[PDB]
Amino acid sequence: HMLTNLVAEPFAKLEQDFGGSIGVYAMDTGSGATVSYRAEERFPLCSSFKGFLAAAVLARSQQQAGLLDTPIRYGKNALVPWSPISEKYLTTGMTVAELSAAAVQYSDNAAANLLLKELGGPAGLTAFMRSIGDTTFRLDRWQLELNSAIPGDARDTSSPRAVTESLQKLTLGSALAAPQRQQFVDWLKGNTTGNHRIRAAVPADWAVGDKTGTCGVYGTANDYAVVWPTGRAPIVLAVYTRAPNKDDKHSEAVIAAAARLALEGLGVNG
Ligand SMILES: [Cl-]
């Protein structure tokens, strides 16, 4: 509260030019200062759930030492659109760790569905998020049905604030044991799908990991990230968008611009 939005930023003009709604929550983990805009509204997760899915797998691996190296074979029926990694291993299978990396770093859809099944489906991932104290997150459906992004539909949504709070717990806090925490960070750092989103606002000499989401309808897309500016504490942030019409286009540039405004609001020189 007292450290929230100490410096106002023109998020309203940005979302008006975009023609929709932008939700932002950014936390300076050193001072506790935050930037918050529509931060408690629900927005569709789209593929951004796959980051939390990989964290849930890592959490289970703390109790099952063989889990990450377990080989998983799958049939052609498991390959759903946009499975760039898993399609190359159809004839061989992949390990749980490889599927998790593909889901995070390439947004591989077949990999995500296989891992979701392992965790007990959308309710199982939701249960994991409850277990770390996130009462907002909900996953309800599987890929690709979870991408419908229907206005007013709370299914398969969270808030920017809850996303940021949960990301902080998993990447910097105590929700994962130290080896699993660093593996989660390493997978996020290796993401290949986010170069035009939060990363476009982050100087090249800072470390960053992120997970994107893009629903394909209702101007709905998002990104969340941990950023390590040199010489100061890391920043955790989430940027989510949506728009009122089914055929509205998403914008990567708006996500990058919102991230820049969040870093400016926090007084982080970039
Ligand atoms: Cl895109």
Tell me which of 31, 87, 131, 145 is the catalytic residue: 145
By residue count, the chain amounts to 270
Residue ranges for the known binding site are 47, 50, 82, 107, 109, 212, 214
Query: What's the CA-to-centroid distance between 43 and ligand 1, angstroms?
Result: 17
Query: What's the CA-to-centroid distance between 196 and ligand 1, angstroms?
Result: 8
Query: What's the CA-to-centroid distance between 177 and ligand 1, angstroms?
Result: 33
Residue ranges for the known binding site for a beta-lactam are 47, 50, 82, 107, 109, 212, 214
Reply yes or no on whether 159 is catalytic: no
Query: What's the CA-to-centroid distance between 221 and ligand 1, angstroms?
Result: 8
Tell me which of 21, 47, 100, 159 is the catalytic residue: 47
CA–CA gap between residue 24 and residue 42 (Å, rounded): 11
CA–CA gap between residue 228 and residue 206 (Å, rounded): 6
Residue 213 phi, psi dihedral angles, 5° rounding: -145, 140
Query: What's the CA-to-centroid distance between 128 and ligand 1, angstroms?
Result: 28
Stated as kind and residue range, the H or E segment containing 264 is helix 252-265
What are the structure tokens assigned to 203, written together? 């100087």
Give residues with Cβ within 8 angstroms of 145, minimum separation 6.
none
Sign of CA dihedral 163, 168, 173, 178: positive
CA–CA gap between residue 120 and residue 125 (Å, rounded): 7
Method: X-ray
Secondary structure class of 4 (helix, strand, coil): strand
Reply yes or no on whether 9 is catalytic: no
CA–CA gap between residue 215 and residue 93 (Å, rounded): 27
Q: What pairing do the DSSP bridges indicate for beta strands 94-95 and 207-214?
A: unpaired
Let me know: does 213 contact 49? Beta carbons within 8 Å.
yes
Q: Is 188 exposed, middle or buried (0-12, 13-18, 19+ CB in 10 A)?
A: buried
Give residues with Cβ within 8 angstroms of 99, minimum separation 6.
72, 86, 108, 111, 114, 115
Please state the CATH superfamily assignment of the domain spanning residues 11-266 in this structure: DD-peptidase/beta-lactamase superfamily (3.40.710.10)
Give residues with Cβ within 8 angstroms of 98, minimum separation 6.
85, 89
Query: What's the CA-to-centroid distance between 199 and ligand 1, angstroms?
Result: 13
Q: Is 196 exposed, middle or buried (0-12, 13-18, 19+ CB in 10 A)?
A: middle
Q: Which residue's structure tokens are 């023609």? A: 19
Query: What's the CA-to-centroid distance between 112 and ligand 1, angstroms?
Result: 19
Let me know: does 242 contact 149? Beta carbons within 8 Å.
yes
Instruction: DSSP letter for 147, please.
Output: G
Categorise residue 55: left if φ over 0, alpha if ψ from -120 to 50, beta otherwise.
Answer: alpha
* Per-residue CA distances from 260 to 11, 40, 106, 150, 241 (Å): 11, 20, 24, 28, 15
